[PDB]
């Protein structure tokens, strides 16, 4: 049922996608010559599209200029079976060189009829058969909130060779929600953000196998999700310990000059010092101006947060809290 952390490949799957994306290149060109009257073959395919690398799907604002008038002239069955025919002609001679069930696949997937056989079931490798077994038992106990057992499956799964980042950082809920002899998950997210720090550029041309951007890699122009979970969960962890200087010293060191969420965290670290110190413990020439420093760090990091891309803050509501820190100070 659940997803597996295997870099699994078979020749019948390497072919049946290649048998598919060889075909799609021809029918895409054919659609534009009839729109003209009116060679890896998959590396060539994804040069029509931008791989999102931040989200799964390239979502896009709508109330903007990205709009279109609805095209009037529509399809029919007479035009569709003549626009597919010449790509279906050239395809039939490599269809006899491929295996017959890959050939049964492309005959079936072209009339509708998606595959019902999921690729991680017939792999029978005996090591993947335990990696499919453990991850459906990994999630099942996390589903059932059984944590001493789901710890034991997770400690055994990371030791079997060939397992990925997918299982690794995502359920780091198990260390924090174990609380017995726990690292509280924060030393493990520190482990993730040390050995998977990679400021390299996302090359956006190769087909991607066993990695996906939005939850397990950390390229340039995309902060890794374990990196920002390490920043949220160590701010919240430091609040509950009442060391904020030590997180504010770290967030200083990485100036992620491509996103606004790290700057909101860096603005919110100073708001927590400006909250804590604004009690004054009296009813002092140095107690005053240090809070003004933190108030001025919040107003200037929230400004550079808001100048960046999309991270909408309640920028009015936070100004009501900064003024309230000063009224307690006067």
């Amino acid at each position: 049922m659940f997803e597996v952390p295997i870099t699994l490949t078979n020749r019948k799957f390497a072919q049946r996608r290649k048998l598919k994306y060889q075909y799609i290149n021809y029918i895409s060109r054919r659609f534009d010559r009839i729109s003209k009257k009116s060679s890896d073959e998959e590396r060539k395919f994804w040069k029509k599209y931008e791989k999102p690398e931040k989200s799964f799907e390239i979502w896009r604002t709508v109330s903007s200029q990205n709009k279109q008038p609805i095209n009037k002239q529509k399809m029919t069955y007479h035009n569709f079976k003549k626009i597919e025919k010449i790509p279906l002609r050239k395809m039939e001679i490599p269809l006899l060189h491929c295996t017959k069930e890959n050939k049964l696949y492309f005959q079936s997937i072209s009339r509708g009829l998606e595959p019902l056989k999921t690729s991680t079931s017939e792999v029978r490798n005996y090591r993947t058969r335990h990696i499919v077994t453990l991850t459906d038992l990994l999630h099942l106990n996390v589903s059932r909130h059984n944590w001493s057992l789901a710890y034991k499956i997770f400690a055994t799964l990371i030791r079997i060779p060939g397992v990925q980042i997918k299982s690794l950082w995502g359920i780091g809920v198990e260390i924090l929600d174990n609380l017995s002899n726990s690292s509280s998950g924060l030393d493990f997210l520190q482990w993730m953000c040390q050995i998977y720090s990679s400021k390299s550029r996302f090359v956006q041309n190769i087909n991607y196998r066993s990695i996906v951007p939005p939850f397990q890699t950390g390229s340039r122009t995309h902060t890794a999700k374990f990196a920002i979970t390490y920043l949220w969960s160590s701010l919240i962890n430091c609040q509950k310990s009442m060391l904020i200087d030590k997180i504010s010293e770290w967030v200083l060191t990485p100036p992620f000059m491509e996103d606004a969420e790290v700057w909101f965290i860096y603005a919110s670290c100073h708001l927590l010092k400006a909250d804590t110190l604004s009690r004054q413990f009296v009813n002092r020439d140095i107690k005053i101006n240090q809070v003004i420093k933190h108030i001025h760090y919040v107003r200037t990091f929230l400004k550079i947060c808001l100048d960046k891309g999309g991270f909408a803050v309640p920028s009015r509501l936070i100004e009501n809290q900064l003024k309230s820190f000063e009224s307690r100070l006067y």
């Binding site: 017939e122 029978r124 058969r129 459906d136 038992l137 059984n146 057992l149 034991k152």
Partner: peptide, 25 residues
């Protein structure tokens, strides 16, 4: 039942008890 996926009841591990997984582990 783990090693053979073709035959049915290759997914009996959904119905294991607490103690049944512990000896498996």
């Amino acid at each position: 039942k783990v090693v053979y996926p073709d035959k049915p009841t290759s997914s009996d591990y959904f119905q294991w008890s607490e103690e049944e997984t512990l000896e498996f582990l």
